[PDB]
Curated annotation (Swiss-Prot), chain A:
Catalytic activity of the protein: ATP + H2O = ADP + phosphate + H(+)
Enzyme Commission number(s) from the entry: 3.6.1.-
Name used for this protein in its record: T-complex protein 1 subunit eta
Species: Homo sapiens (Human)
UniProt-annotated binding residues for ADP: 29, 81-84, 152-153, 397, 482, 487
Disulfide bonds: none
Position of the Glycyl lysine isopeptide (Lys-Gly) (interchain with G-Cter in SUMO2) cross-link: 418
One Pfam family this sequence matches: Cpn60_TCP1
Originating gene: CCT7
Quaternary structure, from the entry: Component of the chaperonin-containing T-complex (TRiC), a hexadecamer composed of two identical back-to-back stacked rings enclosing a protein folding chamber. Each ring is made up of eight different subunits: TCP1/CCT1, CCT2, CCT3, CCT4, CCT5, CCT6A/CCT6, CCT7, CCT8. Interacts with PACRG. Interacts with DLEC1.
Keyword Membrane tagged: no
Swiss-Prot record, chain B:
Name of the protein this chain belongs to: T-complex protein 1 subunit beta
Compartments where located: Cytoplasm
InterPro entries tied to this protein: Chap_CCT_beta (IPR012716), Chaperone_TCP-1 (IPR017998), Chaperonin_TCP-1_CS (IPR002194), Cpn60/GroEL/TCP-1 (IPR002423), GroEL-like_apical_dom_sf (IPR027409), GROEL-like_equatorial_sf (IPR027413), TCP-1-like_intermed_sf (IPR027410), TCP-1_chaperonin (IPR053374)
EC annotation from Swiss-Prot or TrEMBL: 3.6.1.-
Residues with Phosphoserine modification: 45, 245
Binding site for ADP: 29, 83-86, 153-154, 395, 480, 485
GO terms under cellular component: azurophil granule lumen; cell body; chaperonin-containing T-complex; cytosol; extracellular exosome; extracellular region; microtubule; zona pellucida receptor complex
Gene label: CCT2
Gene3D superfamilies, per the entry: GroEL, GroEL-like equatorial domain, TCP-1-like chaperonin intermediate domain
From Swiss-Prot, chain C:
Protein name (record): T-complex protein 1 subunit epsilon
Catalytic activity reported: ATP + H2O = ADP + phosphate + H(+)
Enzyme type, top EC level: hydrolase
Natural source organism: Homo sapiens
Family assignment from sequence similarity: Belongs to the TCP-1 chaperonin family.
Curated annotation (Swiss-Prot), chain D:
Gene name in the database record: CCT4
EC code: 3.6.1.-
Single GO MF descriptor: RNA binding
Name the record gives this protein: T-complex protein 1 subunit delta
Root EC class: hydrolase
Length: 512, 509, 517, 508
């Protein structure tokens, strides 16, 4: 039943909120130091962003928990915008602390936050630029160049331009969501970089070799696919038993009756409807012997992320048994084709009755380039999907961020009062974001930032410091391309995510 | 798991393993002084050792590099016999060198380098001090008697060695060019005197079923068997242990008797006058062997029933899996006879001619097992001495010889190799210090004179710890066989060289 | 909560890493020194091959945890540099650190290392020969498989292991792709012999079930019967005692076994071998009565084995007595019953030409640790050619290639300038650290012997002759016969230059206060 | 180090004089009692060497060597428990310095163990032969020692009974060691001193024979280590009745064991039966043992094993643990065996006369009450001990520590005669003898400092005459007031010092 009142708790709230932003300071452009974080569970914990470690960190603070949840409120929407919100609202809170000693504490606190955050979105949608199917691009040529935005921005190679169209394929196929939970991507070690692939359904990286695995079909044009969340192995149904002998005739039997059931278990789906049986869990010898006795496909230990998207793709269901199951709970494609790619026994699933899954298959022939592009795929995905969703496309990299705080430095003159201080703090927050990607561009922030300000006293269309080019210039014409929608989103967060707890300098906690 | 880099592990290597080479060199020589045995963690009861292998086996050591020596100690002690306390110290002698050499900037690579070649330089000088004695049987007789009891010198009980080594050389005198220590049946058995320790010509059993089985037999067939009787082996003669019905458990005993009784038959029907069982013999089949003229000896010695299988020409029954079918042990003589205070079952007419039973008779078992501990290490050297009949001049003689040899070679080498090789033959010169300082006499006198003596070169005058002073190695009995030396010269520098490559030690302990 | 800033994290990542890197650099070459392992139980073992000994080393610190994970992929394709990556991954480490302490961004020279890694790769790829063949490789494989054994286990050449290690590959090298994999042949440690005693087998082998030695040991056909079903009456790891309604019924029980032996021998006879490989070890009192019916059953051997020896033939295991089928039985080009060790029984040796999905080199040793490091020898001699199978390719040096690899990267630094000049400064020298750090663990000045080939690289280019791993007086990487796949060196670079960059991954070093516990 | 071992062996050297010093002012009855708190925290009042060291003690290796010292004296003698502990610290002074004086401790030991040889050589030379075949000269130096020492009262009665046992058990002229194994110390509860007896056969503690023969001639000595009850599960017999239809069926085979082994006793024939206790043996059927008694065998039911042991070896009743082992032959044959209620109150089976290995005599300690039975123990035993010393080393010698001081004088000069690095050793060695009578001339009072001064000179002068009278504790004659060391009481403690010391000096 504990509280700290006044400014002392208020200011105490910001650092707990700020320190996590000091991590993400630039985690979007990734460069910095990344420490592998092993929590008290023995779990090595890392991220491609700020949010996942934020997901991992917990606080007794409501404050430090809010912007967490807020950055998470921004996170799961776009899959991005976390670090942005993570920095900005904390930056506000970071900057008002000296003001807090002067005091902002009157509820002249909360006003200029959201009052000036509309000025941004007032500037956003007026400078916003919309993209279409015939417009400058197929909208695939956009999602190309927005992949060439998102994929290429981090390095890699002209496959980034090749993937730029290739990633858009399953995108266009599945485009509903902002993200890939229907799409997914298959990492392929082997082949080469220049060829990466896409399947109109799930395509299993590897299914797993058994006794009779070669003697079981790797190919079906009519897969009726038992989609198993559950294993069938020698351990699944025991072969161990015994029986009394004054005659040894029963040694064959007491094992054989159990043997029949391992058979019968897998066979009963096999007999009912099943050709293909995909288990995400082991298949052992004596079971797969009957699966090899069946020679209607056996799988085990296979990815469920593919197997449940196989349910998505096929129309069958993830099966918690091999029994009690119908022929409809079976997955279905017009293609079961296993042609091993590298070490991956590679199941083609396509021709599905629905094919809610269409998965891009990234093939590198090497490990490094892929996971860099696979990380850039999420980039492309989070963008190229959203580039369709909101066709109005703002530009990042201090495009408006320097252009907003430009006016939002210019907006200071008309304010004066207690919140003109906020206006300056609100302004340069926009510019504290590129204030890193400057360093990621190798640039000094401030001079570059001040240039950009001068460059926004000269230019100011898309101009900004782009770690994309490591230059300072128009972002949207630099192919810095993300929809203008996330801006309002972040800016609805930015000023407002800060104003929550600064509305509270008296924060009560209880044991109960 | 914590990485030990060079000096961390290496000092830890020295402090233990050199001190491990110390309390054992405290035992080095018969005048290597007695070390009261203070055991680590268990057995406060204290023997007092003139041989460091005890300490190594008694006292455990936490130093891993020292955990190596006890095994290398047991390498000698088991494989080579004597050379046990010695293999530990010479390594420490070479380790004391690498104390400097490491801190003296010499990388342990180089420290091995000379000792690679230097090991033979001493070997070869000790190949030079290797000269065949025992080239004659009388030589071989006294060449055994040379290094037989010489194995027993530092080893705590060198006194009954008078009777012991005579026994020890006779059995190996009986071997006559063919070493067989299984044809020597080793029975450590209490009763009588310690000078009553005995050598039978034949086989023997310390196990006596009793006199209720025929005691003496001539032209006796011995069944060598794991065959059980109350144990209910195969081939039902009548119900064994089982329940097949309400009363079937009752049909066991009487028909188990018949089973025991026809497990007389199968066993007896070999035509045996003796059934020697490494397993149980029930009293009815027992006494029905006693009524068959068969001597049925219960749970007879594992190694005995094994050596009775080796020496007497017997086959084990395959545990009655040859009910009638197993080749018998055949010994024309059965003697149930008292050596010591105990009637022991003597077997002669055995297959092997070298077949013998050495009966070590404890007046106390502390000396008895010590007699047996002093027995076989000799026999180890003896079989070696059999195969290579020869000596090398001990007591520092060939040591200093090798010392003056390898050092003057370390003087003609002296590249990176002598850095080890001068460090090498100094150990060959430093062990002569050990026994003489164990003898409690100045080595700097004797050694540096033994130096001069072997700087003149010498096969004869060497430091006699018996005299405590420099003295003849003519093959006086303190002249060692080439058997152990080559092994120690091989085994000793190893653990040094072994730790020399691994200074890096990763410890999760 | 602990909060590290920039270098702080790094500096915290520097502590054990270099210390771990330090233990690698004294392991370099025969000049180098093995890493002893005392376990958490205290078990004292001489070991090597960093990922191996880094798996034995308990990784608490983060950067060491990848050193197990990174060096894993290193040993697989290559077999060497697993101890050499952490050298450079430790060497290139404080390269960046001091630069970061010179004020140089992780944004700056970290790319330059990979940017110098490729050009060093690109440079390396010229050094010596990207070319071998199934014949040429043998001599590199000789000087590999002599020294691979002749480093780890012994220092001597053991040929029966040497070329049988490479030919085992060469046996399954041409089974797939012209490329074997590292499981596609197997190394089976058991000691019945000495080190040199070994079995090159084109399939897997086991010690046959022997329920009594005197019963005849036989082997027949080319084929084996691999059996989940009964070979004779099966036993399911469960005792079966003697219960018979009469004293005559016991002797009447005796026929049931023997008749079901030959019946299910006859049922195995027509199908495969006459021999079992049975997932059920049956009653050994009855088994030797079938061994008295002869045609030895292999039983009491793992359930995974019937799986193993089946698939090694490409065949199956017969699940049920009614399911008996020759394809559901395993195979071989020759099944032979050959003595394991000299004195012991005859293990069933299944040499499989009806398929080989693993050609198993079976190995014997005087002791484990030697047969272990003879195995652990073979694995690398197996791994190095797993590079050769893909591209038949090699190079001579860590003190020839790298000092030459560095030599391009060397002045390329001032050819860089701004960002990565300090990288290709800190890259090139970090390459020459390995001959330095090897000359370190050599008896020589790490500066002077590096100066040695330095002058030599100011003279010779792409040298076949470089400093001494084998610790000779002459330094000839061709005639030291230090032989490392230019794939491996390249892959090593790719793998060794990898980790240092990876600690920079995102901007988040942020921990709740637990980055290790 | 040898020094850490030295510091250890110094700690050995030290602690070996530490607790042994309680023995040194305890030398003789003029040596004083020491109240000794114990590990149980109990005062223990002891003047003697064997008791003090073995009663309260500690973990130090020297304490391990302490208890060995009087004990090795005991197995040799049982006489001189204190004196043997007095010679250690004596040499322990002779020892310690030679290290610090620059002499190697093996040289120190191979001195003292050899210095022993040359040293104790003249002891027997100083000594005098006495007749070990003659009962008196036996009884003389027996009782003369007992006159020199405490036990008199029932000794002068039972010291001739000692020798009466000794005279019987002495076959040879040197009388071997007169192993007290040939003698049997036994105790009857009822009876007086004079009831103490010597029987060639063995008296047995109690007896149980219910219907049986109380005295039996030419008596086969039976040994039942088997049972008279069929083997036990829940009962003594094999009868456990859960059914009558089965009980008739159980009736059949339970009839044997009670009959057979019982009859087997007299089938082989037995005049006697030794049977261990119904606790020592599973069950003894009395219903069987009654008929077994009534067969007129002499049954001692529930007889102690250690008498059986003395019955087995000494009077030759060979082990029967089993029917396979039960024959008429493994039975002893008792020339007479009798249950004896006589000699006071209470039953004792007395084998009277037997065919016996060695010369077997049972000397039964007896007295009007239990302590008077216990008074009869050292009354027979102490003489037996001083005899068995006098016989093992034939010659006697004038006692009292004069031969300590006597030959302490000499061996020095003979040490000095040796020269070598061990002359200073053997002389230090030789000196150590002087301190034993010093403490004796101390404990008996007044001046030890003077006593050994003149004596060792008197031992260059009068020797055997001038010595330490334990009563006087000064220059006197152990001849005038008779103090006799049967040589082994001295000859025992001689090497025992040097041996453990040689060990503990060789001990690192």
């Amino acid at each position: 039943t504990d509280s700290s009142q006044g400014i002392p708790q208020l200011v105490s709230n910001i650092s707990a909120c700020q320190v996590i932003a000091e991590a993400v300071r630039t985690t979007l452009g990734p460069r910095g130091m990344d420490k592998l974080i092993v929590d008290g569970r023995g779990k090595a914990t890392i991220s491609n962003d700020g949010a996942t470690i934020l997901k991992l960190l917990d606080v007794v603070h409501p404050a430090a928990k809010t912007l967490v949840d807020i950055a998470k409120s921004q996170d799961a929407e776009v899959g991005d915008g976390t670090t942005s919100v993570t920095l900005l609202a904390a930056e506000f809170l970071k900057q008002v602390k000296p003001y807090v000693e002067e005091g902002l504490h009157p509820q002249i606190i909360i006003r200029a936050f959201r009052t000036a955050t509309q000025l941004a979105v007032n500037k956003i949608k007026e400078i916003a630029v919309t993209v279409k199917k015939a417009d400058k691009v197929e909208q695939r040529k956009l999602l190309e160049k927005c992949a060439m935005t998102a994929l290429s921005s981090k390095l890699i190679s002209q496959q980034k331009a090749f993937f730029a169209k290739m990633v858009v394929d399953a995108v266009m196929m599945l485009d509903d969501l902002l993200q890939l939970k229907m799409i997914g991507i298959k990492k392929v070690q082997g082949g080469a970089l220049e060829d990466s692939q896409l399947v109109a359904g799930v395509a299993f990286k590897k299914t797993f070799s058994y006794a009779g695995f070669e003697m079981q079909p790797k190919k079906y044009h009519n897969p009726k696919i038992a989609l198993l969340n559950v294993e069938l192995e020698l351990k699944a149904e025991k072969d161990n038993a015994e029986i009394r002998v004054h005659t040894v005739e029963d040694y064959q039997a007491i094992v054989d009756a159990e043997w029949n059931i391992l058979y019968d278990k897998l066979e009963k789906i096999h007999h009912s409807g099943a050709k293909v049986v995909l288990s995400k869990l082991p298949i052992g010898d004596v079971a797969t012997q009957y699966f090899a006795d069946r020679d209607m496909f056996c799988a085990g230990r296979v990815p469920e992320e593919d197997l449940k998207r196989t349910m998505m793709a096929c129309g069958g269901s993830i099966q918690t048994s091999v029994n009690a199951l119908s022929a409809d709970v079976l997955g279905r494609c017009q293609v079961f084709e296993e042609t091993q790619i590298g070490g991956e026994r590679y199941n083609f699933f396509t021709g599905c009755p629905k094919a809610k899954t269409c998965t891009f298959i990234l093939r590198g022939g090497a490990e490094q380039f892929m996971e860099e592009t696979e990380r850039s795929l999420h980039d492309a995905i989070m963008i190229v999907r959203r580039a369709i969703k909101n066709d109005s496309v703002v530009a990042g990299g201090g495009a408006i961020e320097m252009e907003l705080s430009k006016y939002l430095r210019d907006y200071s003159r008309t304010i004066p009062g207690k919140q003109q201080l906020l206006i300056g703090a609100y302004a340069k927050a926009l510019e504290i974001i590129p204030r890193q990607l400057c360093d990621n561009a190798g640039f000094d922030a401030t001079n570059i930032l001040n240039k950009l300000r001068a460059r926004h006293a000269q230019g100011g269309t898309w101009y900004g410091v782009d770690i994309n080019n490591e230059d300072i210039a128009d972002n949207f014409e630099a192919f810095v391309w993300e929809p203008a929608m996330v801006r309002i989103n972040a800016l609805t967060a930015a000023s407002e995510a800060a104003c929550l707890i600064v509305s509270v300098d008296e924060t009560i906690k209880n044991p109960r | 798991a914590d990485e030990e880099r060079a000096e961390t592990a290496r000092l830890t290597s020295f402090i233990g393993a050199i001190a491990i080479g110390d309390l054992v060199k405290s035992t080095l020589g018969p005048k290597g002084m007695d070390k009261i045995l203070l055991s680590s963690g268990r057995d406060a009861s204290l023997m007092v050792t003139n041989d460091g292998a005890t300490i190594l086996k008694n006292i455990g050591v936490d130093n891993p590099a020292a955990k190596v020596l006890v095994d290398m100690s047991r390498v000698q002690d088991d494989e080579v016999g004597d050379g046990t306390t010695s293999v530990t110290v010479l390594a420490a002698e070479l380790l004391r060198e690498a104390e400097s050499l490491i801190a003296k900037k010499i990388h342990p690579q180089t420290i091995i380098a000379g000792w690679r070649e230097a090991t033979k330089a001493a070997r070869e000088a000790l190949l030079s001090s290797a000269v065949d004695h025992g080239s004659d049987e009388v030589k071989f007789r006294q060449d055994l008697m040379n290094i037989a009891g010489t194995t027993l010198s530092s080893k705590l009980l060198t006194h009954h060695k008078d009777h012991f080594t005579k026994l020890a050389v006779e059995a190996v005198l009986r071997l006559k060019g063919s070493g067989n220590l299984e044809a020597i049946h080793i029975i450590k058995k209490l009763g009588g005197s310690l000078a009553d320790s005995y050598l039978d010509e034949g086989f023997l059993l310390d196990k006596k079923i009793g006199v209720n089985q025929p005691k003496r037999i001539e032209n006796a067939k011995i069944l060598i068997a794991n065959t059980g009787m109350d144990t209910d082996k195969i081939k039902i003669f009548g119900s064994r242990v089982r329940v097949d019905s309400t009363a079937k458990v009752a049909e066991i005993e009487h028909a188990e008797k018949e089973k025991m009784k026809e497990k007389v038959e199968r066993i007896l029907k070999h035509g045996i006058n003796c059934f020697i069982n490494r397993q149980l013999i029930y009293n009815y089949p027992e006494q029905l062997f006693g009524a068959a003229g068969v001597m049925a000896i219960e749970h007879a010695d594992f190694a005995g029933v094994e050596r009775l299988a080796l020496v007497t020409g017997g086959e084990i029954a395959s545990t009655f899996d040859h009910p009638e079918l197993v080749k018998l042990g055949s010994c024309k003589l059965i003697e149930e006879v008292m050596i010591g205070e105990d009637k022991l079952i003597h077997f002669s007419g055995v297959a092997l001619g070298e077949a013998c039973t050495i009966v070590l008779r404890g007046a106390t078992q502390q000396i008895l097992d010590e007699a047996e501990r002093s027995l076989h290490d000799a026999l180890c050297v003896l079989a070696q001495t059999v195969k290579d009949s020869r000596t090398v001049y001990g007591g520092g003689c060939s040591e200093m010889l090798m010392a003056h040899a390898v050092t003057q070679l370390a003087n003609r080498t002296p590249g990176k190799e002598a850095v080890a090789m001068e460090s090498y033959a100094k150990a060959l010169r430093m062990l002569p210090t050990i026994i003489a300082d164990n003898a409690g006499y100045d080595s700097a006198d004797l050694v540096a004179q033994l130096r001069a003596a072997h700087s003149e070169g010498n096969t004869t005058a060497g430091l006699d710890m018996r005299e405590g002073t420099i003295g003849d190695m003519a093959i006086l009995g303190i002249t060692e066989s080439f058997q152990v030396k080559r092994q120690v010269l091989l085994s000793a520098a190893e653990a040094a060289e072994v730790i020399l490559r691994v200074d890096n030690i990763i410890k999760a302990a | 909560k602990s909060r590290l800033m920039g270098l702080e994290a790094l500096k915290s990542h520097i502590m054990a890493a270099k210390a771990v890197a330090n233990t690698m650099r004294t392991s370099l070459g025969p000049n180098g020194l093995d890493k002893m392992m005392v376990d958490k139980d205290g078990d004292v073992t001489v070991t090597n091959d960093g990922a191996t000994i880094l798996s034995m080393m308990d990784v608490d610190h983060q950067i060491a945890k990848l050193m197990v994970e990174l060096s894993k992929s290193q040993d697989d394709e290559i077999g060497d540099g697993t101890t050499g990556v952490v050298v450079l991954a430790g060497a290139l480490l404080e390269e960046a650190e001091q630069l970061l302490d010179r004020g140089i961004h992780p944004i700056r020279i970290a790319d330059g290392y990979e940017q110098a890694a490729r050009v060093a790769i690109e440079h390396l790829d010229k050094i010596s020969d990207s070319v071998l063949v199934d014949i040429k490789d043998t001599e590199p494989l000789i000087q590999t498989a002599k020294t691979t054994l002749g480093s780890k286990v012994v220092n001597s050449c053991h040929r029966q292991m040497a070329e049988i290690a490479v030919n085992a590959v060469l046996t399954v090298a041409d089974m797939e792709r012209r490329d074997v994999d590292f499981e596609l042949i197997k190394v089976e440690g058991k000691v019945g012999g000495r080190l040199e005693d070994t079995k090159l087998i084109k399939g897997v082998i086991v010690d046959k079930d022997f329920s009594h030695p005197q019963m005849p040991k036989k082997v027949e056909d080319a084929k084996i019967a691999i059996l989940t079903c009964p070979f004779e009456p099966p036993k399911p790891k469960t005792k079966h005692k003697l219960d018979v309604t009469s004293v005559e019924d016991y002797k009447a029980l005796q026929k049931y076994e023997k008749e079901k032996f030959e019946e299910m021998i006859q049922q195995i006879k027509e199908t495969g071998a006459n021999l079992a490989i049975c997932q059920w070890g049956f009653d050994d009192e009855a088994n030797h009565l079938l061994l008295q019916n002869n045609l030895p059953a292999v039983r009491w051997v793992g359930g995974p084995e019937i799986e193993l020896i089946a698939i090694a033939t490409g065949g199956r295991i017969v699940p049920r007595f009614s399911e008996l089928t020759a394809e559901k039985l395993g195979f071989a080009g020759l099944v032979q019953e050959i003595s394991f060790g000299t004195t012991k029984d005859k293990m069933l040796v299944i040499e499989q030409c009806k398929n080989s999905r693993a050609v198993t080199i079976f190995i014997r040793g005087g002791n484990k640790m030697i047969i272990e490091e003879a195995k652990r020898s073979l694995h690398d001699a197996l791994c190095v050619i797993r590079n050769l199978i893909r591209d038949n390719r090699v190079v001579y040096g860590g003190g020839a290639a790298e000092i030459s690899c560095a030599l391009a990267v060397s002045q390329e630094a001032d050819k860089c300038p701004t960002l990565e000049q300090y990288a290709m400064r800190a890259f090139a020298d970090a390459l020459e650290v390995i001959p330095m750090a090897l000359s370190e663990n050599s008896g020589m000045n790490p500066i002077q012997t590096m100066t040695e080939v330095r002058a030599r690289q100011v003279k010779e280019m792409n040298p076949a002759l470089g400093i001494d791993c084998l610790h000779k007086g002459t330094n000839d990487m061709k005639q030291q016969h230090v032989i490392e796949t230019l794939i491996g060196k390249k892959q090593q670079i790719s793998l060794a230059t990898q980790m240092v960059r990876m600690i920079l991954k995102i901007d988040d070093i942020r921990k709740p206060g637990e980055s290790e516990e | 180090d040898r020094d850490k071992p030295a510091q250890i062996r110094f700690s050995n050297i030290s602690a070996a004089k530490a607790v042994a010093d309680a023995i040194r002012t305890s030398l003789g009855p003029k040596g004083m009692d020491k109240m000794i708190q114990d590990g149980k925290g109990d005062v223990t009042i002891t003047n003697d060497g064997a008791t003090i060291l073995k009663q309260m003690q500690v973990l130090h290796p020297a304490a391990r060597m302490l208890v060995e010292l009087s004990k090795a004296q005991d197995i040799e003698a049982g006489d001189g428990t204190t004196s043997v502990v007095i010679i250690a610290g004596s040499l322990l002074d002779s020892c310690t310095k030679l290290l610090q004086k620059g002499i190697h401790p093996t040289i120190i030991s191979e001195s003292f163990q050899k210095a022993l040889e040359k040293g104790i050589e003249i002891l027997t030379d100083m000594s005098r032969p006495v007749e070990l075949s003659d009962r008196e000269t036996l009884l003389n130096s027996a009782t003369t020692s007992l006159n020199s020492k405490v036990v008199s009262q029932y000794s002068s009665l039972l010291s001739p009974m000692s020798v009466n046992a000794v005279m019987k058990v002495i076959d040879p002229a040197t009388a071997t060691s007169v192993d007290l194994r040939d003698i049997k110390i036994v105790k009857k509860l009822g009876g007086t001193i004079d009831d103490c007896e010597l029987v060639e056969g063995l008296v047995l503690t109690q007896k149980v024979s219910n219907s049986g023969i109380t005295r039996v001639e030419k008596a086969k000595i039976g040994l039942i280590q088997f049972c008279l009850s069929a083997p036990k599960t829940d009962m003594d017999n094999q009868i456990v009745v859960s059914d009558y239809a089965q009980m008739d069926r159980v009736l059949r085979e339970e009839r044997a064991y009670i009959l057979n082994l019982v009859k087997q006793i007299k089938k082989t024939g037995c005049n006697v039966l030794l049977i261990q206790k119904s606790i020592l043996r599973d069950a003894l059927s009395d219903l069987a043992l009654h008929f077994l008694n009534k067969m007129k065998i002499m049954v001692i039911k529930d007889i102690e094993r250690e008498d059986i042991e003395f019955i087995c070896k000494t009077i030759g009743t060979k082990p029967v643990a089993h029917i396979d082992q039960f024959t008429a032959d493994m039975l002893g044959s008792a020339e007479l065996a009798e249950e004896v209620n006589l000699n006071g109150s209470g039953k004792l089976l007395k084998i009277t006369g037997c065919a016996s290995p060695g010369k077997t005599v049972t000397i039964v300690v007896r007295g009007s009450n239990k302590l008077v039975i216990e008074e009869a123990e050292r009354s027979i035993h102490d003489a037996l001990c001083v005899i068995r010393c006098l016989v093992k080393k034939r010659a006697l010698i004038a006692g009292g520590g004069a031969p300590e001081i006597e030959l302490a004088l000499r061996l020095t000069e003979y040490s000095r005669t040796l020269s070598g690095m061990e002359s200073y050793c053997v002389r230090a060695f030789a000196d150590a003898m002087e301190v034993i009578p010093s403490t004796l001339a101390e404990n008996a009072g007044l001046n030890p400092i003077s006593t050994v001064t003149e004596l060792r000179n008197r031992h260059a002068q009068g020797e055997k005459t001038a010595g330490i009278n334990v009563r006087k504790g000064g220059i006197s004659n152990i001849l005038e007031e008779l103090v006799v060391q049967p040589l082994l009481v001295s000859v025992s403690a001689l090497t025992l010092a040097t041996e453990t010391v040689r060990s503990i000096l060789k001990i690192d």
